[model samples]
Target chain A: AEIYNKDGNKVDLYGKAVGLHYFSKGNGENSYGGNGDMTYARLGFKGETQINSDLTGYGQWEYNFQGNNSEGADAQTGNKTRLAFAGLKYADVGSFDYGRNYGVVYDALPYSDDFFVGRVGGVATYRNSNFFGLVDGLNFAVQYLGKNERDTARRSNGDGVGGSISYEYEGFGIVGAYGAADRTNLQEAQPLGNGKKAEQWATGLKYDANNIYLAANYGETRNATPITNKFTNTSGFANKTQDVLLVAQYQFDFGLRPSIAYTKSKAKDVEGIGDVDLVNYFEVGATYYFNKNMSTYVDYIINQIDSDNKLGVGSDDTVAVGIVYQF
Target chain B: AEIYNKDGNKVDLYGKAVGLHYFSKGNGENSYGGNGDMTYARLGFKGETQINSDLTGYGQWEYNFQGNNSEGADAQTGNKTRLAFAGLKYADVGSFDYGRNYGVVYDALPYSDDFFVGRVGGVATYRNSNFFGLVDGLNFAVQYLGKNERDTARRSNGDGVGGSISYEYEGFGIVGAYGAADRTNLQEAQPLGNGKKAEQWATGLKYDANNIYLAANYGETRNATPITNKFTNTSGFANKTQDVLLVAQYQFDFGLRPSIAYTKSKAKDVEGIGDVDLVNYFEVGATYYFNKNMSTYVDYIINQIDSDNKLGVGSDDTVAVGIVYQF
Candidate 1:
């Protein structure tokens, strides 16, 4: 809630909290309880000081209070700095921001990434953006993630340049993003490493009208690229990984929301590894809203895996039921 | 704090940051130099859409700007998600909300209550407040915590029901609560437990008139189990664990808030872990609010341990000084 404002500037706070009834069982010989992302349970603020009628200097700092449940206390999660930026914008010149936000190379994936969640072989950058006043209801951004590390042996793998485009109207919106970075042979060097280059591109489309929200995304990762400030890991996945995701949700007048999302991951084969696992996941959930400040919810997740090896380990299904509040 | 609104939606945000200087040495092996919970240092947001007239849809999310220092960054601690939930309300009927908020079974120790921010049981839930349809000004809730992982086992043991009731007028507010759970069978469960079941009950009262404020609270936990959703050993003590707290504060028109708090605890005994001590803690602090967005504070704490046996652990008087800011 915005508690105060003076002159033309305003100060405000925002975030979400949830109480989860979560249950999970992995496939095969692995583990026991616990899995629900309160990690994405977030909180932040917005402060804008009007530089003038047409321009303003603004900064945002957001972080997640993730712990064991949808409801936890402590301040953490390694990547807790969700967004930190200082920037300026105008009625005609668009905006430029410095610090960290989303990587321009990443596309929307309500089925996964957008869920304040994670994955293997992903964009790991906290970037800066320069947006152009190129069109109405549309914007383009040139994003960059400069290398910053003392001695990780592979700072070069995390450096990159990316671009993004977002266009929207009443019920439709779309985003396209791309990034390329220099690969590093960290396995061969300790203080620094250099090798081939890796690249990535993604696109997403979303529709929100009536009481329904629908979105779909596609992206491909080449070699080993670190799109974020997070360090790079070359041996985690193969040289090529292809992915796609689709998500849908419908809001009911009575405060009930039903939703569904699906994601697929595929990777090329290598020497030591005959072939990487091909995985597909499906998630379904329903939420009942009481007001903007509270509600109840439940979600179910299932996965399937296939490989020259299969169960291939993808046999777990999860169920989560809980309440949510944000005020 | 709605900074923007459109069609039928509204968005508002809030929170604060603190720079603290703290030092402490416990009667035992627990200590820290700084902490993030400075009461006023926090941030959050509120969003809602008018569904019709009497009904609306909404959500809230907020968290602490806490990490290493009262001033460090890069979120972490393993358990920091403060509050997360979604619910409903009526002009006349209270509201029904699920998710995380507070424990139904606990009381306010404003003297120390708000100091830790939110939760009941006192250290209550840290919690997942699954409140029933309740009210404003006068809020009542029934809380719940679901099952969890191993080592972290008896997350099931910690799962239980709780109740809380709060009533207030223009100058006074009172809160009372009770939390119950299944005591665990883990070896780590002793030093303060013995009963087969665990339970906590508390009562808190506060008076605010003119510029002065006063508060007092009393709570007791059965079976000596931990009061939070966190795991507790059932093997700790024998009889019961009892505590009493007292707090006082005054606010000056110019932006000054001075407060003090004290708590005393006594527990049943055990032979192997003899040398039982009666513990007393005293805390005093003063805050200067520079308007509503910023403040400076200093606090001092001293603990006295008296016993047939001493921990020798009782050490020094702690001191803390800091600044808080909100947007």
Candidate 2:
């Protein structure tokens, strides 16, 4: 994937193609759904130039396209930019960039699958690794999310800030992150709830030694979760929410990895209606790596919430299988 | 640019970044216009696999993004696919592909710069070279364009077929092409000169030898041209149209290539208003190639048309300069 490397400048090409299918007993569907071609592909380019001995310039652009969509109007709806940024990196200090990018808070929620893909864009972030070349396994990031579009109902964040810090040694790591933003005008206009801000904070612990892996995270959000009405298919805002996730995985010698995870989310004080479980599910999955370029996976989700609290926000059992080729 | 090659399969990455600026005394602007970044970049992946001794499978995907636009609502309008297709090739036979692609009629319109970028998509094309391996420098193509969408107003072609054949020998070539299509319901709905079909026929002659190049083409279209009204900024259908282009170029030993060209387009019997000139301009340009991967270029356009016939479809004087880096 290193296509160009000359004169202190390097350019790389990276991409992946995923052929996927889903069988859902759930009422809701994934982005592309179950019956059609659930395949998708991504392509990206990254390049860096050594402006000097201690300073460098870098940029990246990545895009995603759905194979199931035709080359027409829907194609526009199904294709989008995954990432685009350009910045300067100062040696042993940090790197600063601007453009569409992931929120730093996602550094605490790494697991598997489409449980929470997280928000992107309107961000300018600064990141440093090894605690700015001091500690061996310390890293931290701070990001500022600017107000994007004027449409308050559609913008992901408004004049927000997020930060994360992590440290790892001897195959064990801990991470903490917090994000907060002012609620947009339209978001505050909804009649179901009264809140002026959206906030999230999370902490996670992970241990990976030998061929075994374990991880856990606990998080909370205030005025940041969307609840749905099963009857009218309308969305209601949550006043407060709590979430927990646990993951365990084992890697075999022969390129096979199996994983199991459990996750739950609860919304509190929703119109003063007490706590409501939003998500309660167990995920079981396995992946077989064929080589450096190919892999296949299968995942099953067991829905665990009661029908009464499930509402439309909760899901039913579903299974997915996919093959991926990447470089 | 050749990033991966293994087991009879080869993948290539090709792209270019253009830093461009425009100075216009024209009424209408180019796609990106005269201010701001006015820069753009393109990235593409092309791969081919040998299926057998005499067979091959190939695919290509290319994308373009504007550097001047912000990553928001307008980004969607400024960025789009330039090309995407997949096909198969048989030795000594031909090659066939399907997806968004160029119209065969455009094979006759090679020149200095962006006078007419032409149309794309709804096409499945088959191309053969060297008279299917029988004769040298002989090439031909036949293409079919399907109805792309239910929104006839926006679709490019409706059940169309186009064909072209060309032969070159001893630095001289002759090319001819013709295309016809059914008029979409919305296309015929406009209250203009009555026409039930869209059609185009063209022929071109070219001579290139000893670093000197010359080319000329003449074409006609029936109900295939969009005429813009200068008063209300609206569009009117053309009953008939004629177009002509001529070019001459010379390459110097120092990697300087200078070109001069002239083009004219006239719409006939447009809404019973008689003949109206759409475009009448002279283009002069020069390209300095620093190497195969880098070049600098400058171009100037001199508009020549009466004010009455110019309408909104014609432009005024303009100049452009840019640098391009490609692989």
Candidate 3:
């Protein structure tokens, strides 16, 4: 949402215009919803200035207005919602930012679901869209989760510090990132006061040729402390978990594109807790572009949750067909 | 957040990237305190396709990633975080969308505050952004808001039905819309029976020439029941509010685009329990474009709250400066 003026100096003014919708069927529920009547409603800004031949100075501020609502309560009672940040970039030294933003590891993972018009599920569903525990790029001279809200308990609570670096040459690209945080380790069975730390790392590679594209990613997270809570934590728990993903897409001369993706996560429990085993997800989808900003789609998703924890849910599956447009 | 592939079809694979920061000084707090983090980190996809020359279909799916976490806590919760919807769009006949979506009145509003990120001051503090609250350009349809979150409280929140039509020729354009909802009216003093109605209408006009632009908007909202319980059955109490706004912006060939805006609101007393008064807000700022996606800016905002319901602790004047970038 940022824009630069012709004077070569940075001017700050940026935002986003968005439209959204929702639909679901479960029991007797049969209906649709959305927030597009709110205007091209989005929050973003811009800034820029060139430092020298090979160096440049830059900053940005973006916010989230899509989900911050009080329903019908007093208008002023809603939570303040926004994603604002600023940073300076250097051509050779890499860009340095100071604000609430995203982190390196936070940018590495991939998605395998199809629900637009604002996330369709709650924060507990694997397909839910809240980025609470995900890597948030953010403030302080040090890389961190910036500023975010988290649930009191559950899998989506915690923060971290980290950065990422990427390099591209010819037809190949590589990206790597690392982050660390001090919070209640979701992986281990330890007390609140226990000196536990969480860390994450990720790497990704991609290649493209003619009408074909392929990408691969791997990420891992580990907690130094364990949780002793009885609600969900039990037996042998592995504070360490690893994920691997692969994606490929091909385009035909007739304008048809088909794509497939697969992701797997392996977790190792620590202590005498039983092994939590593995979880996996797979998806296949396609797109046909009408012009540059419009198209339709169809897809399917499957999830397999394997664990010895009696408290865990079995598995689930879903299939969906839809369309999309943008400007 | 929508991606249209080559075959003129919509695909469900899209990514959102975001960044932010907070800088402030206050009582005993110097550095970036008070929610010192960028707010929105998201990746999304949207696309639309042509069913024929006169018909089209659309859909979108987006996921908000914190981009700062590593434990996978925030990324893999549930399907609740995803927002997905689909519908058919007809060119001259208008579009009919049946799913989780916005109502008719919601679409009639003008773009609200021109702040860098969002209306940081608050919703009620700004001028009415709904310009087409009660007009018609397209056919008709009824959309819902919270069909899934059936907590009458949350369900009655933003649910409604509405639409708008825009006509533009050369440098002049006009647009208008309206939306209404029948849900549990939570704002009523006495718990009204479920299905009380609330409605809003708006309209706007704009003119553009060379590097100059100007726009004006007006909108109002009315509730079927009194806003408070103390009012007599015959008394209207407090159930209506209106807003007006005017804005002007000029872009210098040199790249500096400066703008100013004024907004005011009026409220009516139905039950006479709450104060009915006027609110004024003024803002001035500029944007320097650097290419089409990056920019920085600084702005000053002033608000004059003229009621006993002042929503803040003190000081109604606020100033902000920030930058933004997009890809």
Candidate 4:
């Protein structure tokens, strides 16, 4: 008999082998493989089971394939991508999951936005820009760029602990989440440096219409002040900031859907700059679905930054078009 | 006439922000914020276009949104994820890609395999267990496990230079890729350790019958030996070897699919042990689709070791369940 129960135990596994060949005229000439257009080639698994009407079990894992080199590549370790966790989901009371998972601030970005997703273009600009320059302004003539640029507040590299809660009914939905990671900063006297903490928060709303969908989100992050950057040079103050994003998408027949989005981040040093550094991004795009599993898209993006900030290029722009297929 | 003839020149950009919550019984009892289940939150862009019918252009950049911490903690600075490259493809002549991307050995795992895939259950065992051990006769030896037990092979922290090629026709496909990274061993050696290279090779076959699809694949990887270990005194070998992986999956109507997979890796002269080692993994899973965009799943996994490998337990296993939604 075909199992037709909604509450029955179910399992899901997904895999994708993407091969990207890249060539660019602006940046030196080069070529490479894997999900280069993406990241590493990957395969993943996740599943759940029903323990009872009010109780359920869950789990997931993912890993990379280290082609010919056994275990020497630093980033391409075959076992490096695994993420495991389990928990329960309550029907109307929300769900609880525990394990190594994604954080809350990581959850609120719009699916329609081009800059925050895993796409290649978004990742490049995000790394080179100096958004943390805001922390430098907080102190009097003191520059406080974090030690690890790859781990700043905006792009927390999964080193903390956090959770999120989301619910939707009718045409409206709401979500909120948070996460934190251990951080370290250098002090003049302390050669080894002192350990601090970093945290994030995110919330968003969504509405769906017969032909359109709209979403807006806000997220904030804070870092403990360093010993050197503190007001009295004892312990530094905390840095706080927020990001606002607005998104909208319209669907039409004949395989065409258009989307528009905007996001802004404002940061301040709690004890120093007050409210000084800012970053803004705006994007618009459209997806033409040939079918449920295939689509073609094009997008335009713009990034803006305020003065006294080291985020570089006050503004940058780009346009893109591509195709996506799923199986 | 908006260059419709140059469709590959059209580019698109994208990004995502994710949030997760965890409630665990082991370790500590705490609720955190952020995309804990995943890495830090992120924002970025990607663009691609066609230079000609046989050539394509592509580039990508990504950054972390340090402004908000997913865990509700404080942070020190922001992070970055970036990539820029291009390549060419021939419909019947295979394809070539080059750039700062994943190496060849990084791309040889089957999409449906458990060892290379980063899933919740997959990571727990891979990280917690010291799987990289050397075997000799009836004895096994374990070497120094890195700070992050799971960080083996490739750059766990940065980027590298690499390229890949893949060919697919009908129901068969084959892929090959390679990458080189500049690294320094504990001795701070020069050129010898600088050009560490990794390589990979993979091939697979698939057949679809009605609503069901089936597939099988194998892959292998090799990497340059570390300098400290190469000198016999520091106890490092000059080469690491990885075996092949086997995977298969079956799909059914009502969104239900099941899969089984196995992977084995062998390393030589791994620190304290003799010149032989082995790591093996077995996994089984199933997935149920509620729709094209939503699915649920569960999995069971096991890892086995031979000889006196002190990397951890000789064998360990676990079960997991999860759900995913894509749009």
Best candidate (score: DockQ): 1
Per-residue lDDT over B102-212 for candidate 3, one digit per residue giving the tens place of the 0 to 100 score: 344444333111111111111111111222233333223333333222222322333443445556556777767665655443333243222356666778788878887
TM-score of every candidate relative to the true structure: 0.64, 0.58, 0.47, 0.39
- The alpha-carbon RMSD values of the candidates against the true structure, listed in the order shown, are 8.1, 9.1, 14.6, 18.3
Report the lDDT tens digits of candidate 3 across residue range A1-327.
Answer: 112357677564432223332222342111111212221223345667777765666655554433322222222221223344455665434455554344445444431100110111121111101122232222112353422223322233244555556555556667676666555333223322222555667788888677888989987766522233234544222366677888999988766798898877666553444344345667777777654444556555555544333324234444444344443
Candidate 4 ranges beyond 4 A from true positions? A1-10, A16-42, A51-55, A63-83, A88-96, A111-167, A178-195, A224-238, A270-278, A306-309, B1-327
Candidate 1 docking: what grade?
acceptable
Task: Write one digit per residue (lDDT tens) for candidate 4, span B1-327.
Answer: 011124446433222222222222222111111111222233334565666675555554544432222221222123334433344444333344433333333343441111121111111110101112221111111111112112332222112333334444444445554443323242123222222433334444455455545555554443343323222434222245555566777777656788888766666544454344345767787887664434457666655544354433234444545444321
* DockQ list for all candidates: 0.24, 0.05, 0.07, 0.03
Model 4 chain A: lowest-lDDT 10 consecutive positions? A120-129
C-alpha RMSD in Å of predicted model 1 compared with the true structure: 8.1
Worst 10 residues of 1 chain A by lDDT: A111-120
Could you tell me the lDDT of residue A321 within candidate 2? 71
All candidates in order of DockQ, best leading? 1, 3, 2, 4
Local error of candidate 1 at residue B136 (angstroms): 15
Tens digits of lDDT, candidate 2, A1-327: 676789999998777655455556422442112322254567888999999999999999998865433334544646877789999999999899997776776788751100122656767889999988988899999888786545535344457788889999898999999888777777677644567777878899999899989999999888777676665555546788899999999999887999999999888887745788877888999997644555668888887876566354544567777655555
lDDT measured at residue B85 in model 4 versus the true structure, 0 to 100: 38
DockQ, structure candidate 2: 0.05
Ranking, TM-score, top scorer first: 1, 2, 3, 4
lDDT of each: 0.55, 0.72, 0.46, 0.41
RMSD in angstroms, candidate 2? Answer: 9.1
Lowest summed-lDDT stretch of 10 residues in model 2 chain A?
A110-119
